[PDB]
Amino acid sequence: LTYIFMIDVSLPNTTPTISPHVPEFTARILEKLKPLMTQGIKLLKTILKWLMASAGRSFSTAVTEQLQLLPLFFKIAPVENDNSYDELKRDAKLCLSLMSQGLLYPHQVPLVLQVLKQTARSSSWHARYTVLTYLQTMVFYNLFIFLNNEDAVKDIRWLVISLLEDEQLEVREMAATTLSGLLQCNFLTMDSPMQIHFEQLCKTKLPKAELVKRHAGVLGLGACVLSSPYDVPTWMPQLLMNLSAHLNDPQPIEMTVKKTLSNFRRTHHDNWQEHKQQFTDDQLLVLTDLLVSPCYYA
Amino acid sequence: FQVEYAQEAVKKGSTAVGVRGRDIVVLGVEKKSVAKLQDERTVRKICALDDNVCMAFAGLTADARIVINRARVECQSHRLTVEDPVTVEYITRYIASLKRRPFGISALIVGFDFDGTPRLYQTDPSGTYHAWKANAIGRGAKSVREFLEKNYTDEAIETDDLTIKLVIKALLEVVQSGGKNIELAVMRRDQSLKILNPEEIEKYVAEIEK
Amino acid sequence: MFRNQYDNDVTVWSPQGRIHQIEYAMEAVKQGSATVGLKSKTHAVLVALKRAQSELAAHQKKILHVDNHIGISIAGLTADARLLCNFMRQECLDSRFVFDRPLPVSRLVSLIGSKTQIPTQRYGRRPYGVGLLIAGYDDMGPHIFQTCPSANYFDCRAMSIGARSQSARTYLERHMSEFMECNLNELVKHGLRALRETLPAEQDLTTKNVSIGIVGKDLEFTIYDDDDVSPFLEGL
Amino acid sequence: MFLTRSEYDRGVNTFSPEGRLFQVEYAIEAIKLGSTAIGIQTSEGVCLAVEKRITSPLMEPSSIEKIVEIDAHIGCAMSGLIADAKTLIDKARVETQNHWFTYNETMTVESVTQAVSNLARPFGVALLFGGVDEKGPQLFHMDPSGTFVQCDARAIGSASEGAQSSLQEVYHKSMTLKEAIKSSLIILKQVMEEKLNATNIELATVQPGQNFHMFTKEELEEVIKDI
Amino acid sequence: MEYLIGIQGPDYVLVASDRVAASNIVQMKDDHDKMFKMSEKILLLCVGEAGDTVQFAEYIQKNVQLYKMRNGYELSPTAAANFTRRNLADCLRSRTPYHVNLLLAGYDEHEGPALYYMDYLAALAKAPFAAHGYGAFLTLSILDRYYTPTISRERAVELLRKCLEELQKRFILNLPTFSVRIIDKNGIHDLDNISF
Amino acid sequence: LVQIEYALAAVAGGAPSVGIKAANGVVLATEKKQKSILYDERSVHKVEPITKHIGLVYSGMGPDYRVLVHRARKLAQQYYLVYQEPIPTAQLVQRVASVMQEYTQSGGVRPFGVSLLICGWNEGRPYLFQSDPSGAYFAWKATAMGKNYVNGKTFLEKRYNEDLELEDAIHTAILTLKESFEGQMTEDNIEVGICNEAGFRRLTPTEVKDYLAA
Amino acid sequence: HAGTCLGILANDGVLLAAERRNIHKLLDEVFFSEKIYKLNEDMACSVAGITSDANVLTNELRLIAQRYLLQYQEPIPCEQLVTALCDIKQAGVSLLYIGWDKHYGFQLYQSDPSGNYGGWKATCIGNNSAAAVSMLKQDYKEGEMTLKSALALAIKVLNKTMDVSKLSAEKVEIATLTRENGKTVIRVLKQKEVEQLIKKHEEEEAK
Amino acid sequence: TTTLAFKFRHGVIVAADSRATAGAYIASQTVKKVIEINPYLLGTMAGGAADCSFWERLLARQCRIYELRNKERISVAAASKLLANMVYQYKGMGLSMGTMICGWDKRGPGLYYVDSEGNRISGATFSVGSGSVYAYGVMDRGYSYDLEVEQAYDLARRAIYQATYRDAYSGGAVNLYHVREDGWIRVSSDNVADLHEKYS
């Protein structure tokens, strides 16, 4: 099927060929996969094995009628990506890896971001997880298509931050791993209403939904901490001190502050004699004398 | 890491199919071509472990011959200490725990376990092992196992019709026209392990072609 | 960036005459939670602060029985603390079997520092990443020996080790002249006050995360559980 | 997203200058990968539930049992590989029989968990020991650093931190066993998005009056049809 | 003592043994097979002390069964005799010798039938006929009298019964029942039990 | 096989040694120079006996030779205690070359920087072998090692003829060391050992001076 | 690739055909067992390697061939001696094995250096093996082969793989293994019999 | 000491006395000489008291580890063979054992006399001890394979009584167990002085 549809190229001064079309066929595939969005899951093992073969073996890697095969693939692709899963799951995870690592034309940045904002809106936490791991290897291999369409970098920044508020913990920690990498590759500048959105989210009362609301600021401060692993900027010692104030918080918060500070100290012992000059003497006594040790030291 | 290098020879080694029945259990492997001047006796891949247990393999033929002659001692060192023959799960758990690096083979250990119960197991090279109704190991194992999932229920009425319209019909899904390219094994409950000669192996294919 | 060459193994001297791998193992006693030990010429008291993995879990065995007259206090790897504690228990049993007397607390700590020094000199093995506070009672009175991953050991009037213990060593060095005349219930308050200064201003010494170990003159060594520390935390 | 290594990451018996052992933690971090197991200690027993992850219909489900029987009064659930933990179930089974032979007692759940942890390359599995002792029903977690602790409820596995946050909301210290069987299978429906049947879960409870009991295909059906 | 006997013909290795196992003055089992089959065409009649028989003969039975599994073909009766003689000899200088008196008997497709004898010191001797126990003292001279080398297998059963009637008349132990089986070219059959 | 190729560089830097198998004898001639007049020429010996009938010379490293001359003497007496016959020269070299192979095999131990020339006499037939640091060994009619052995083996191939006697082989062995000597050889600068029906013996220096008058 | 030994199976014997390779002129032409190493009374072998690692591999086969005979008082079957070395090489030279046993008759094997063997009707190992493996596959009646017809095939495929102008009649080492009067005979054929097969080939192939 | 076991159609009976002696002195008469291995096996304590109560408590350990590993109860033919292989390693060192592994398995009723000299034989009827010769003739004349359960209780109960009546080293009280298909049960612990009133 990758050679049945190789002539449909969309080259710049071309003509729609007589040879059969991808949009005329994929619309029929969605008509057969409409109960999913047992005989449709049998059809996925031919579509996924086709989309695995048309990765770099076609002259346009993403026809827009194929892009809504993604929300059907996100809810199937597993999280751990292990050899114990089914062949439907294992071939759906490494089909998403070949589409995210493929290019896209700059008139597809409203079209794929409409899908991923729809897929991670509210379907199931496997789909919210894999949209984040779709994005991190898709706004990197297309990193300057997105930075030209300045309306799109506002939509990535919305989706990553609005998915720190997820009801599933495993989703929101990938949203902070995604945000920490986007800050690191300078896809998202650390503006002031980003930090105001987290610093006015950490100071959140806990009466006993409020726990997941308070945690997402601690993910957000921690995403900024992990974003510069080998430098201490001017904003850096401030959002380590009030990041360290959430150390005696309850336990979903307490792991994250212990992961962020123990990963801080790991990467910042290379030339810490040059990093400690960006700290006050009153702030070195906070970071040096602090418990982030794992369970096997207690 | 090191176990992944074991599995790459299972995916290239010859196919091994086993189903399990009400009274008999059947192995069947793809007898490959050898050479023009190679005597094809020493290249048979259905080995007997004891009187009530035998196994196929797929992978390195060097590391298989280590696994077989270690499992053939534990089939006999069991009888010294227990006097009872091995259960099929005992020698399967022995082979899996035997598999520094694991020995790069995947086996289909079949047989009976002193109460007449039919058994069919699989030692993947990771060290894991579990039960099976019908299974496939080798080069075209994913498609043969998909074929055996389609056909299991009303085949065990006759032990002849169970074990050709499944087993030879599952090798014929991947292997050639047959007769000289199928090594087929069958054992009844507490009789012997009999490898069918190709005068009788071509007999059963003619019923399948009809 | 700064790739040190003299800290692969523990058998490599640096040109400063300073083994880095031993100094890196001494930073592993700063990884555990703080514990305080102190003595009074009557009863010797270990006070410890415990951590839990989560809620719905116990905290930790932080103070361990060694003999009837010796107890220790973990700070560092519990994998190496359990390895030293089975050495100290058996050595106390061997002296109890042979001489039929309690092993002197000064002499067991000498047996640790002979064992602890061996991985700091031979290739492959790593130092014991645990520092013990050892409370004892011998014929010569009570003892608050401290062991370190660097295998020297320290007889102490009082000592706190662990994380944020420098604020607790500051407390104990201010009040160490008053310790030798305290009662039992007064000394443990000084241990709980020393343990208190290792906490933030938004954390409290609850009875769930405080463990107290006491050995003394006629009192055998006994640890105090999640509810038995309540007669010690109430008067505070 | 990006790879940020340090220079103190590839040495086993080597302390990091903050006093860490990163060739221990990175092995332990590489163990939260298998099917999620949840154990809940109640005052009337202790439940043990686990996901199963069967691929083919020809595979018999009764032979990838990731919940085993240590002795008649102690159960155990695994996460990691089923063959990685076979040398920990062997010592736990033998030490309860060494303790029976020598002392004519049932070994307590803490002491089986202590004797298993004394073997600590670290392990590649974390375990949940569920059992009824003289202290009543108890549950012990057995992290791959050889660190063991008493737990009221503890989820292990891939989606553990995230099921543990659900266990904190649903647990209380006056909880019945028929709740915790259903309250954990709510969470197994959360941590994997499939429908429950007799092929994707295994559940086993250890009550005071009864021995260790693995639920059968009828007893698994009568619980899933409630929730 | 327990009783063994073997009569080799041109194509058969007729062997018999008592079915009695005794403690002190009582006898505990009335149907005790002392014959161990090792291949389809060889046996091993083992008597001797308590315990050493079932520990040695089971050791030789599974190590010869291991030869069939590793190779497909079974041992010859001569090589199974020398394999049995090899293990019994080099263990009698060890701390744990065996006090087993053996009578090995097999058929070979090429070499023909064969009866072997060894004592507890493992001195292998191929014999046309042999016997063990205290009852060997009576029954060898019926065999020295009436054995031709070309005796039929039906005249060997009646030669066997003359030896066993001598034990009924003259021997002091009660050996009432005997297990009798033949080792012709078709394998190990099992003749009817000679009993009195 | 890297250290084994480098041990042969330590052999080919060593002093020249020449062995020639005659009709009724074997001759082992070598270079024993001293750096100064201070060295006692007769204190240490390079041509060295193993049995009454086997001797061996080397080219390469001095101290590594003594390990092999101490093992070859043990292996010749472990034969003689068992079989009560003097060891065949073929069987001695199989055991010496197994020792030299045993240090290439095990790690943390460098190979020997020694090639050996092993003469002998068994059953009225002469023998001359050469054991390499690799553990390989070859039977020779005439060969040479040491400095300029490529020039030595081409020199031997022109002046070898299997009908020559033992006295004629001592001349063509000293003439082979003469080509790569760089000096004036006295009775002390070389060491010759001959092996015949009477056994192995290294020549006394007054016996060598008769051969140096040719 | 050093040796050029090749095996050929027939109805009444097997034959090894190795060439004696002499690099330098001053190497002594040894009068000992040169190229075909006899293992016991009914089995021989030949290696594709140097004559020092030959003496390790053959004197290990001879331990296995005599630990068997000490234990069973029968000669070893000619596959178990192949298998027991292939188990030792599984934990670095290729061999051939000719022999006879009462089970599977005349046998020929070829041990890989990895530890794998196989029964061959004719094969080659060593120098220019695939040049002569392909030449045997051209002309070998796989079943209709007499001993002398196999023996003429050997000096045919050796005249196209080794040397110049004489087939090295004093440097080729054919040994045949036959059955005669119940015992087993291993005949390293003499130089007069090895020269006439060159003469019976140079006359038959020129005419 | 006198023990007794016989297989009949409804399982296998185990009978034993209760007296342990010190040469001539009676140490106690309350000895549980039927060693309860686990709910499906049971052995008798004939010979030395420690040498049976150790090696069958070690058998009970080993039969349990078989059950946990292999997910099935050990057969009686194999649980005796474990005991025979354990005590043959100490042959000639002075173990005064001798016992009868009883129980039910897939093969039917199981009964295996195991002695310290290395014997291991199956069989329908056995009797071990110093008064084993006296329990034979009462049991051999009243044995059938097709008894009743109430008849097979009184057969073994009386055959131990006649054994205690002639053997000076056999006495105390009888202990009668019955091994049916779903395990063993204790049916009586009748005193010998109380049996003397009924039988006479």
CA dist F104 and F2 (Å) reads 10
Question: Whole-angstrom Cα distance, residue G167 to residue G160?
Answer: 9
CA angle, residues H71, H36, H46, in degrees to nearest 5: 125
Q: Which two tokens stand for residue G19?
A: 């060439």
C218's tokens: 């006629």
User: Per the structure block, which two tokens stand in for H114?
Assistant: 């195991």
CB spacing of B87 vs H106 below 8 angstroms: no
Domains in chain B, number:
1
Identify the CA nearest to H140 among candidates H163, H173, H117, H120.
H163
Strand C44-49, strand C35-38: pairing: antiparallel
Based on the number of CB atoms within 10 Å of its own CB, is G23 exposed (0-12), middle (13-18) or buried (19 or more)? exposed
| Interacting residues of D121 by C-beta distance below 8 A, sequence separation 6+ | D12, D27
Helix and strand numbers (H, E) in chain D are 6, 10
**Rg over CA atoms, chain C:** 18
**What separation, in Å, do the N-terminal and C-terminal C-alpha atoms of chain G show?**
34
Q: Chains C, D: CB contacts under 8 A, how many?
A: 71
The rounded Cα G53 to chain-centroid distance in angstroms is 17
The structure tokens listed for F78 are: 């472990």
H interface test, pick of D62, D67, D94, D103 with most H CB neighbours within 10 Å: D94
Q: Of the candidates H47, C89, B72, which has an alpha carbon nearest to the alpha carbon of residue E23?
A: H47
Q: For domain H1-200, give its CATH number from 3.60.20.10, 3.40.1130.10, 3.40.50.80, 1.10.8.60.
A: 3.60.20.10
Binning chain H into helix, strand and coil, the percentages to the nearest 5 are: 35, 30, 35
Task: Return all residues near B210 (Cβ < 8 A) that are at least 6 apart.
Answer: none
| Angstrom distance (rounded) from CA F180 to CA F170 | 16
The C-alpha torsion from G89 through G94 and G100 to G106, rounded to 10°, is 130
Contact predicate A59/A9, CB 8 Å: yes
Q: What DSSP designation does D63 have?
A: G
H49 is in an annotated binding site: yes
Query: Which pair of tokens denotes residue F95?
Result: 């055991």
Chosen for mutation from C35, C50, C54, C62 (greatest number of chain A CBs closer than 10 Å) is C54
Q: Is H1 assigned a catalytic role?
A: yes
- Show which residues on chain H lie within 8 Å of chain D, measured between beta carbons: 57-58, 60-61, 64-65, 68-69
B37/G120 Cβ within 8 A:
yes
The CATH number given to whatever domain includes residue B99 is: 3.60.20.10
Element (H, E) at B146: helix B141-150
Q: Environment class of residue E146 by beta-carbon count within 10 Å: exposed (0-12), middle (13-18) or buried (19+)?
A: middle
From residue F1, how far is each of B95, F6, F133, F134, G57 by CA, in Å? 37, 9, 11, 8, 20
CATH 3.30.565.10 assigned to F1-214: no
Strands H175-180 and H11-16: antiparallel
Question: Could you tell me the CATH number of the domain that includes residue D103?
Answer: 3.60.20.10
Contact B84 H78 (CB under 8 A): yes
Can you tell me the distance from the alpha carbon of E90 to that of E97, in angstroms, rounded to the nearest whole number? 9
Burial of G206 from C-beta contacts in 10 A (0-12 / 13-18 / 19+): exposed
Chains A and H touch (3+ CB pairs under 8 A): no
CA distance E74 to E65: 8
Distance CA H137, CA F16 (A): 98
Residue D2, chain A, CB below 8 Å: the answer is yes
Beta carbons within 8 Å of E122's beta carbon, 6+ residues apart: E85, E88, E89, E92
Q: Contacts of residue H67 in chain D, CB cutoff 8 Å?
A: none
Query: Distance (Å, rounded) from C-alpha G124 to C-alpha E64?
Result: 36
Long-range contacts of C2-10 (CB under 8 A, 24+ apart): C2/A270, C2/A271, C3/D7, C7/D14, C7/D17, C8/D11, C8/D14, C9/C123, C9/C124, C9/D14, C10/C119, C10/C120, C10/C121, C10/C122, C10/C123, C10/C125, C10/C126, C10/C127
Measure the CA–CA gap between F131 and F111, rounded to whole angstroms: 13
Nearest chain E Cα to H140, which residue?
A: E28
Record: contact D86-B126, CB cut-off 8 A: no
Is residue G5 helix, strand or coil? strand
Rounded Cα–Cα distance for residues D216 and D203 (Å):
9
Helix boundaries (H) for A162-209: 169-184, 192-202
The per-residue DSSP string of C77-112 comes to -HHHHHHHHHHHHHHHHHHHHHTSSPPPHHHHHHHH
Q: The tokens 């744990």 sit on which residue?
A: E96
CB contacts, 8 Å: D62 with chain B: 131
Q: Is A205 exposed, middle or buried (0-12, 13-18, 19+ CB in 10 A)?
A: exposed
* Mutual angle of helices A210-225 and A169-184, in 10-degree steps: 30
Say if residues C144 and C179 touch (Cβ distance below 8 Å): no
Q: What is the DSSP string of D25-55?
A: HHHHHTTTTS--EEEEEETTEEEEEEE----
Domains in chain C (CATH in brackets) are 1-236 (3.60.20.10)
Contact by Cβ (8 Å): B125, B76:
no
Q: Is G139 exposed, middle or buried (0-12, 13-18, 19+ CB in 10 A)?
A: exposed
Q: How many CB pairs under 8 A join B and H?
A: 18
Residue with tokens 């014999």: E127
Catalogue the E-assigned strands of H145-196.
175-180, 183-188
Instruction: Give the tokens for residue C96.
Output: 């109890």
Q: Do D167 and C56 touch (CB under 8 A)?
A: yes
* Six token digits for residue B52: 């009530």
Across the interface, which of B81, B83, B115 has its CB nearest the CB of H106? B115
Judged by DSSP in three states, G46 sits in strand
Q: Report the residue of chain H nearest B90, measured CA to CA.
A: H70
What is the C-alpha separation between G18 and F93, in angstroms, rounded? 25
**What are the chain B neighbours of G142 within 8 Å (beta carbons)?**
36-37
Chain centroid to CA A261: 22
d(C-alpha H105, C-alpha H96), whole Å? 28
Contact check, Cβ <8 Å, G87/B65: yes
Angle, helices A152-161/A109-119, rounded to nearest 10 degrees? 10
Q: Are residues A293 and C202, on separate chains, in Cβ contact within 8 Å?
A: no
CB nearest H58 (choices: D71, D93, D101): D101
Whole-angstrom distance, CA of residue D189 vs CA of residue D191: 6
Residue whose token pair is 């095996």? G7
Q: Per-domain residue ranges for chain H?
A: 1-200
Q: Which residues contact G54 (CB under 8 A, 6 or more apart)?
A: G37, G47, G93
Substitution target in B77, B81, B91, B93 with the highest count of H β-carbons within 10 Å is B81
Cross-chain Cβ contact G74/E82 below 8 Å: yes
The residue type of E168 is Q
Which of G9, G90, G118 faces B42 most closely, judged by CB atoms? G118
**What resolution in angstrom units was achieved for this structure?**
3.0
Q: Which two tokens stand for residue D128?
A: 């949940």
Which amino acid, D125?
Answer: V
What is the C-alpha to C-alpha distance for residues B53 and B120, in angstroms, rounded to an integer? 10
Amino acid making up residue H128: V
Centre a 10 Å sphere on the Cβ of residue A219 and count the other Cβ atoms it contains.
Answer: 27
Q: How distant is the Cα of A8 from the closest Cα of chain D, in angstroms?
A: 35
Report the residue count for chain A. 298
Strand duo F114-122 + F55-60: pairing: antiparallel
F171 and chain G in contact, CB less than 8 A: no
Query: Among the residues of chain D, which ranges form H helices?
Result: 22-29, 86-103, 109-117, 160-170, 177-191, 217-224
Number of folded domains in chain E? 1
**CA H32 – CA H11 distance, rounded (Å):** 21
Token digits of residue A13 = 């001064």
Q: Do chains G and B touch (3 or more CB pairs under 8 A)?
A: yes
User: Which amino acid would we find at residue G102?
Assistant: K
Q: How many CB atoms lie within 10 A of CB E24?
A: 7
Q: Hunting for tokens 């997203």 — which residue is that?
A: D1
Whose tokens are 């932080």? That residue is C62
Is residue E93 within 8 angstroms of chain G, CB to CB? no
CB contact under 8 A, A269 and D16: yes
Q: How far apart are CA A117 and CA H179, in angstroms?
A: 71
Contact between residue H1 and residue H19 where contact means Cβ atoms under 8 Å apart: yes
Contacts of B81 in chain H (CB under 8 A): 81-82, 85
Which DSSP letter does residue B49 get?
Answer: E
Q: Which of B154, B189, B152 is nearest to B167 (CA)?
A: B152
Point out residues after which chain A has a gap (C–N over 2.5 Å): 37, 208
- DSSP letters, F126-160, are EEEEEE-TTS-EEEBSEEEESTT-HHHHHHHHHS-
- CB count, 10 Å around CB of F174? 20
Task: Assign domain G5-206 to a CATH class.
Answer: alpha beta
Which chains have 3 or more CB–CB distances shorter than 8 Å to chain A?
C, D
What kind and span of H or E run contains F163? none
In this complex, do B42 and G119 lie within 8 Å of one another by their Cβ atoms?
yes
E95 touches chain G (CB under 8 A): no
Structure tokens given for E77: 């009766």
Query: Per-residue DSSP letters for C122-150?
Result: SSS-----B--EEEEEETTEEEEEEE-SS
Which residues constitute the domain of residue D91?
A: 1-227
Structural domains in chain D (count): 1
